[PDB]
């Protein structure tokens, strides 16, 4: 070949830039709903006459 390996005048290219990071884990979750309220007491029956 006409221009041998000593005549190659182009500087070499850089190495590959590093690979990106992975994604994050799945986020947690919003705390579920506390169970419903306890119904109040009940009116004691009619007093006597």
């Amino acid at each position: 070949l006409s221009k041998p390996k000593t005549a190659r005048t182009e500087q070499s290219p850089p190495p590959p830039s590093p690979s990106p990071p992975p994604p994050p884990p799945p986020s947690p979750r919003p705390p579920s709903p506390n169970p419903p309220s306890p119904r109040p007491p009940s009116p004691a029956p009619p007093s006597p006459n």
């Binding site: 070949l1 006409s2 221009k3 041998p4």
Partner: protein, 48 residues
């Protein structure tokens, strides 16, 4: 006599064989040329 191993001749009546010339591809590079057989009338690049 047969031409020597790296010499060649093409004309019939010759008083001496001629050495194979180098092959010119460009500036300042020459590929030397050899011969395949003993008595031959043409030279090829000696690398291949």
């Amino acid at each position: 006599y047969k031409c020597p191993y790296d010499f060649f001749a093409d004309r019939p009546g010759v008083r001496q064989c001629t050495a194979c010339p180098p092959l010119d591809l460009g500036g300042g590079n020459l590929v030397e040329q050899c011969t395949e057989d003993l008595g031959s009338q043409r030279c090829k690049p000696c690398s291949l």
